[PDB]
Design an enzyme around this catalytic site. Structure first.
Site, short mmCIF file in Angstrom:
data_model
loop_
_atom_site.label_atom_id
_atom_site.label_comp_id
_atom_site.label_asym_id
_atom_site.label_seq_id
_atom_site.Cartn_x
_atom_site.Cartn_y
_atom_site.Cartn_z
N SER A 217 -21.94 6.74 10.47
CA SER A 217 -21.72 5.29 10.55
C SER A 217 -20.26 5.05 10.92
O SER A 217 -19.82 5.56 11.97
CB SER A 217 -22.18 4.64 9.24
OG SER A 217 -22.59 3.30 9.46
N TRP B 229 -25.11 4.65 -2.88
CA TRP B 229 -24.03 4.42 -1.92
C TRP B 229 -22.77 3.81 -2.55
O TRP B 229 -21.73 3.80 -1.89
CB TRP B 229 -24.52 3.51 -0.78
CG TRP B 229 -25.69 4.08 -0.01
CD1 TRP B 229 -26.97 3.60 0.02
CD2 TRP B 229 -25.68 5.25 0.85
NE1 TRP B 229 -27.76 4.39 0.84
CE2 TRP B 229 -27.00 5.40 1.36
CE3 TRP B 229 -24.69 6.16 1.25
CZ2 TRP B 229 -27.35 6.45 2.25
CZ3 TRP B 229 -25.04 7.20 2.14
CH2 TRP B 229 -26.36 7.33 2.63
N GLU C 227 -32.58 2.84 12.39
CA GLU C 227 -31.21 2.44 12.03
C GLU C 227 -31.11 1.01 11.49
O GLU C 227 -30.28 0.73 10.62
CB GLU C 227 -30.29 2.56 13.25
CG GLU C 227 -30.18 3.98 13.85
CD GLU C 227 -29.34 4.91 12.98
OE1 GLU C 227 -28.88 4.51 11.88
OE2 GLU C 227 -29.11 6.04 13.41
N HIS D 102 -30.98 4.12 8.08
CA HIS D 102 -29.58 4.42 8.34
C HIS D 102 -28.94 5.18 7.18
O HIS D 102 -28.88 4.67 6.05
CB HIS D 102 -28.85 3.11 8.60
CG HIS D 102 -27.40 3.27 8.94
ND1 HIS D 102 -26.98 3.77 10.16
CD2 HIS D 102 -26.28 2.94 8.26
CE1 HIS D 102 -25.66 3.74 10.21
NE2 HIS D 102 -25.21 3.24 9.07
N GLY E 156 -19.33 3.24 5.87
CA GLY E 156 -19.31 2.13 4.94
C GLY E 156 -18.73 0.87 5.55
O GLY E 156 -18.08 0.07 4.85
N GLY E 157 -18.93 0.68 6.85
CA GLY E 157 -18.41 -0.50 7.52
C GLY E 157 -16.90 -0.61 7.56
O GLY E 157 -16.38 -1.69 7.87
N1 LIG Z 1 -19.52 -6.68 5.37
C1 LIG Z 1 -20.38 -5.50 5.36
C2 LIG Z 1 -19.49 -4.24 5.19
C3 LIG Z 1 -20.29 -2.99 4.96
C4 LIG Z 1 -20.46 -2.30 3.76
N2 LIG Z 1 -21.28 -1.13 3.95
C5 LIG Z 1 -21.66 -1.11 5.32
C6 LIG Z 1 -22.47 -0.19 6.04
C7 LIG Z 1 -22.67 -0.43 7.39
C8 LIG Z 1 -22.06 -1.56 8.03
C9 LIG Z 1 -21.27 -2.43 7.32
C10 LIG Z 1 -21.05 -2.25 5.95
C11 LIG Z 1 -21.34 -5.56 4.12
O1 LIG Z 1 -20.85 -5.50 3.00
N3 LIG Z 1 -22.76 -5.64 4.29
C12 LIG Z 1 -23.74 -5.70 3.14
C13 LIG Z 1 -24.93 -4.70 3.33
C14 LIG Z 1 -24.52 -3.28 3.74
C15 LIG Z 1 -25.25 -2.11 3.00
C16 LIG Z 1 -24.48 -1.54 1.81
C17 LIG Z 1 -23.91 -0.17 2.02
N4 LIG Z 1 -24.80 0.90 1.72
C18 LIG Z 1 -25.54 1.73 2.60
C19 LIG Z 1 -24.88 2.70 3.42
C20 LIG Z 1 -25.67 3.53 4.30
N5 LIG Z 1 -27.00 3.39 4.36
C21 LIG Z 1 -27.67 2.45 3.55
C22 LIG Z 1 -29.08 2.33 3.62
C23 LIG Z 1 -29.77 1.44 2.87
CL1 LIG Z 1 -31.46 1.40 3.01
C24 LIG Z 1 -29.15 0.56 1.97
C25 LIG Z 1 -27.78 0.66 1.88
C26 LIG Z 1 -26.99 1.60 2.64
C27 LIG Z 1 -24.99 4.57 5.20
C28 LIG Z 1 -23.46 4.54 5.36
C29 LIG Z 1 -22.73 4.11 4.06
C30 LIG Z 1 -23.38 2.87 3.37
#
Ligand SMILES: N[C@@H](Cc1c[nH]c2ccccc12)C(=O)NCCCCCCNc1c2c(nc3cc(Cl)ccc13)CCCC2
Ligand SMILES: *[C@@H]1O[C@H](CO[C@@H]2O[C@@H](C)[C@@H](O)[C@@H](O)[C@@H]2O)[C@@H](O[C@@H]2O[C@H](CO)[C@@H](O)[C@H](O)[C@H]2NC(C)=O)[C@H](O)[C@H]1NC(C)=O
Ligand SMILES: *[C@@H]1O[C@H](CO[C@@H]2O[C@@H](C)[C@@H](O)[C@@H](O)[C@@H]2O)[C@@H](O[C@@H]2O[C@H](CO)[C@@H](O)[C@H](O)[C@H]2NC(C)=O)[C@H](O)[C@H]1NC(C)=O
Ligand SMILES: *[C@@H]1O[C@H](CO[C@@H]2O[C@@H](C)[C@@H](O)[C@@H](O)[C@@H]2O)[C@@H](O)[C@H](O)[C@H]1NC(C)=O
Ligand SMILES: *[C@@H]1O[C@H](CO)[C@@H](O)[C@H](O)[C@H]1NC(C)=O
Ligand SMILES: *[C@@H]1O[C@H](CO)[C@@H](O)[C@H](O)[C@H]1NC(C)=O
Ligand SMILES: *[C@@H]1O[C@H](CO)[C@@H](O)[C@H](O)[C@H]1NC(C)=O
Ligand SMILES: [Cl-]
EC number: 3.1.1.8
Length: 526
Positions: free
Chosen positions: A195, A79, A322, A435, A113-114
């Site tokens: 997302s 990612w 999710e 997710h 990606g949030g």
């Molecule tokens: N302040 C938030 C901003 C953020 C960054 N990436 C996000 C994704 C969804 C919601 C929010 C965010 C933040 O940095 N949170 C730290 C943890 C977020 C996960 C990192 C992004 N990577 C993933 C992403 C996705 N699925 C994931 C699934 C797993 Cl099992 C592990 C990571 C995934 C799907 C959409 C793109 C990113």
């Protein structure tokens, strides 16, 4: 191999896919680089060039913080950006069938990606397979994220907000003026995203300046009524000011704050983004969409409720688990490296990490609705409840609510439930159908035999790919040839949806009915 666009000629490159050929145009610019005086402003249109632009490799991804919680772990790093970060990142990609199609339907991908991270370059967003197999044209774009994309001092054109959405829109605009040169039909454009990309797609259904830039919409695990999707204009400015103090740019000529924030380096802005929020969560959208009066003319809740959106077909869906992915980014007792059997007190601590500004009564109400076990003994109870809590609240119930409300104004809607756990995934099994892990099936990666994928997974992907393409081309996501389950229209009353898996496709009704009555009617009031 060379296409003339309205701003100049672009040279592409040829790919062999499945014994066929796809023509890829990687990294076409679609705006002036948003550098210097242009940082934080709306994207400005590209002035002509005279050479032949070489769109033969992905361009820079936009500046963003990278997830550093699982270094070296592919489940996590798949990612992260796979190209140079840079403010000079407003580029897009085009995959067209070879030979050049005549009037091909166009699919435009918007990554999630949030709203803080993401890039069109990722392996799981590779459009070459959809081009080869369904002979559609796939377009994807980079759009600014984090504060460089969504910092808001409302009214102020130096930092109006929603810049990343305006990046997306200008790219849609580019497809309107240019895709016919590539063999595409500008009158048959389907947006799809996942997302925050899906939440972006939904906001394009609201935004009047996007009405005429696409035909149809696909929303994968996301929508604008999700609790993380829209930043209030009060906390948006609170966040702009906290960023200003954290960087020494607090002035009271608001425009002087912006000029000051403009003389900072990208890294200095990126490292302070995390602290503008009082308390953050792994789902935190520090800088996101706002009601700017330009892209978004009113609170989207009111536009949805009163029918103020583009009238068209939508395709909407969610994944079975999710919420699990976010548990390993902060919840106590959780780890991708064990089975994360947590206790009742650990669950309670998790709700405070995921619902920080919420009253003691509010969190009791979550615990009460999710801890009435059918069997009291099983040790997974709390681990599973917290995942369902985070997923139902943040994704599944907003997606369902959006589909109900949207369909109530007369348009065909289709809802799916992705529940296939991929054979060879690097995350543990307790995390389930996570997710973002339907995306590779949508993009047809399991079609590459060459790989980690089972035969059942190849067939599932081939069917999903045909359903998505038929939805794009014809407004109807059926697979008509292989005696497949028909996908019923989703209506406010019956609420039928289609399940997606390798075993049995089934028609079901009223997904998460008990849980979402809690999130949609009770919980908004605490
Ligand atoms: N302040 C938030 C901003 C953020 C960054 N990436 C996000 C994704 C969804 C919601 C929010 C965010 C933040 O940095 N949170 C730290 C943890 C977020 C996960 C990192 C992004 N990577 C993933 C992403 C996705 N699925 C994931 C699934 C797993 Cl099992 C592990 C990571 C995934 C799907 C959409 C793109 C990113
Ligand atoms: C709005 O912002 C204020 C100030 O934010 C603080 O300073 C920033 C530079 C950054 O470091 C933030 O993390 C800080 O919180 C918030 O007021 C603070 O509230 C928290 C606890 O809620 C605490 O740090 C202090 O008591 C407060 N500091 C000040 C200077 O008042 C406020 O909570 C934010 N939210 C809203 C809705 O106003
Ligand atoms: C699942 O693992 C977590 C922690 O992960 C590993 O263990 C640590 C000791 C450390 O070496 C990490 O780098 C590893 O990734 C366990 O949570 C810990 O539990 C104990 C409780 O006494 C304690 O070490 C910490 O407080 C906990 N860490 C937290 C909450 O982050 C958890 O117990 C493991 N679960 C099972 C069922 O084994
Ligand atoms: C643009 O590309 C021209 C042709 O490059 C061809 O494609 C790449 C992928 C290589 O395989 C190369 O050897 C091929 O000839 C170049 O001649 C031209 O200089 C390039 N222009 C710029 C500005 O880089
Ligand atoms: C492509 O299709 C549209 C209608 O969907 C039509 O108006 C247009 O002329 C077509 N262009 C071609 C076939 O080149
Ligand atoms: C300072 O604020 C005023 C409004 O009070 C604004 O018109 C002016 O442009 C600002 N200064 C600069 C240098 O932009
Ligand atoms: C339909 O079935 C055949 C095998 O009988 C398979 O090769 C083909 O890919 C299937 N098509 C779709 C769209 O699923
Ligand atoms: Cl890669």
């Amino acid at each position: 191999i060379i296409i003339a666009t309205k701003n100049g000629k672009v040279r592409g490159m040829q790919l062999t896919v499945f014994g066929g050929t796809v023509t890829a145009f990687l990294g076409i610019p679609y705006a002036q680089p948003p550098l210097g005086r242009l940082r934080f402003k709306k994207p400005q249109s590209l002035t002509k060039w005279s050479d032949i632009w070489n769109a033969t490799k992905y361009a820079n991804s936009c500046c963003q913080n990278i997830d550093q919680s699982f270094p070296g772990f592919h489940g996590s790093e798949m990612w992260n950006p796979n190209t140079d970060l840079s403010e000079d990142c407003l580029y897009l990609n085009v995959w067209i069938p070879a030979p050049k199609p005549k009037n091909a339907t166009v699919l435009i991908w918007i990554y999630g990606g949030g709203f803080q991270t993401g890039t069109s370059s990722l392996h799981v967003y590779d459009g070459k397979f959809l081009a080869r197999v369904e002979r559609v044209i796939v377009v994807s774009m980079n759009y600014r994220v984090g504060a460089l994309g969504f910092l808001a001092l409302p009214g102020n054109p130096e930092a109006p907000g929603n810049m990343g959405l305006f990046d997306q829109q200008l790219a849609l605009q580019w497809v309107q003026k240019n895709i016919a040169a590539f063999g595409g039909n500008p009158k048959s454009v389907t947006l799809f995203g996942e997302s925050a990309g899906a939440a972006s797609v939904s906001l394009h259904l609201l935004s009047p300046g996007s009405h005429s830039l696409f035909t149809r919409a696909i929303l994968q695990s996301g929508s604008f009524n999700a609790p993380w999707a829209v930043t209030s204009l009060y906390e948006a400015r609170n966040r702009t000011l906290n960023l200003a103090k954290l960087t020494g740019c607090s002035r009271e000529n608001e425009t002087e704050i912006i000029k000051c924030l403009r003389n900072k380096d990208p890294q200095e802005i990126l490292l302070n983004e995390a602290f503008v929020v009082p308390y953050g969560t792994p789902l935190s959208v520090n800088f996101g969409p706002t009601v700017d009066g330009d892209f978004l003319t009113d609170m989207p809740d009111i536009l949805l409720e009163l029918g103020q959106f583009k009238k068209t077909q939508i395709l909407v869906g969610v994944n079975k688990d999710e919420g699990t992915a976010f548990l390993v980014y902060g919840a106590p007792g959780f780890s991708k490296d064990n089975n994360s059997i947590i206790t009742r007190k650990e669950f309670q601590e998790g709700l405070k990490i995921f619902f920080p500004g919420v009253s003691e009564f509010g969190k009791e109400s979550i615990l009460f609705h999710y801890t009435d076990w059918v069997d009291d003994q099983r040790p997974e109870n709390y681990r599973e409840a917290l995942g369902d809590v985070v997923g139902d609240y943040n994704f599944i119930c907003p997606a369902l609510e959006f589909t109900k409300k949207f369909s109530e104004w007369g348009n065909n809607a289709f809802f799916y439930y992705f529940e296939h756990r991929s054979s060879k995934l690097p995350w543990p099994e307790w995390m389930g159908v996570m997710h973002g892990y339907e995306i590779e099936f949508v993009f047809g990666l399991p079609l590459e035999r060459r790989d980690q994928y089972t035969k059942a997974e190849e067939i599932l992907s081939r069917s999903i790919v045909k359903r998505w393409a038929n939805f794009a081309k014809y407004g109807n996501p059926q697979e008509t040839q292989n005696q497949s389950t028909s996908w019923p229209v989703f209506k406010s009353t019956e609420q039928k949806y289609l399940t997606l898996n390798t075993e049995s496709t089934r028609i079901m009704t009223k997904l998460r009915a008990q849980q979402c009555r809690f999130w949609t009617s009770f919980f908004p009031k605490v």
